Design a protein around this ligand. Structure first.
Ligand code: HEM
Ligand SMILES: [Cl-]
Length: 154
């Protein structure tokens, strides 16, 4: 699949707003991920004891991890689909070490969309939401292909 230049412009314009508060976006995204899909929290041995939204917001390690995640994703989105070298290490770790099924990447994709609409309801209208849906779908499709290249169905 492919995004137009104009869809990429909407993706990166919204990403600038994420970059104005990376840590806060990361926390909101992970809290939604873990509350709606508790099975995902189980993958994070160091976080899996956190239960309430207050406890997750108080974890300095979870806050740091949200920055790590969104920094890697931002680098990928800024490549506008030419992200092979960025995606390679991410698939390697998530498929062979952490064993994150592709389904969990759909869960976190939903959470990103929800948080972007919650924080930026004006700038994240239908056009902008459609573009970022497409960018995250391309990301999942390409990392699923790398999973299979490594021998993992995901
Ligand atoms: C946008 C999607 C994602 C991005 C960009 C991302 C990015 C990263 C990065 C940069 C790291 C540190 C280096 C590495 O181990 O590769 C990491 C680690 C990790 N990720 Fe992800 N990740 C994503 C989705 C997920 C999901 C949905 C899970 C579900 C639990 C997950 C579980 C983990 C785990 C278990 C680690 C090891 C660190 C730890 O145990 O706290 N990842 N991720
Ligand atoms: Cl998918």
């Amino acid at each position: 699949m492919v995004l137009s230049e104009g869809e990429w412009q909407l993706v990166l314009h919204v990403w600038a707003k994420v970059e104005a508060d990376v840590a806060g976006h990361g926390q909101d995204i992970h809290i939604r991920l873990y509350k709606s899909h508790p099975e995902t929290l189980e993958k994070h041995d160091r976080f899996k004891h956190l239960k309430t939204e207050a406890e997750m917001k108080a974890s300095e390690d979870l806050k740091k991890h949200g920055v790590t995640v969104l920094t890697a994703l931002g680098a990928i989105l800024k490549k506008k689909g030419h992200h092979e070298a960025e995606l390679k290490p991410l698939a390697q770790s998530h498929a062979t070490k952490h064993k994150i099924p592709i389904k969990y990447l759909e869960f976190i994709s939903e959470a990103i969309i929800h948080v972007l609409h919650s924080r930026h309801p004006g700038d994240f209208g239908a056009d902008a939401q459609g573009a970022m849906n497409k960018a995250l779908e391309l990301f999942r499709k390409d990392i699923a292909a790398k999973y299979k290249e490594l021998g993992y169905q995901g």
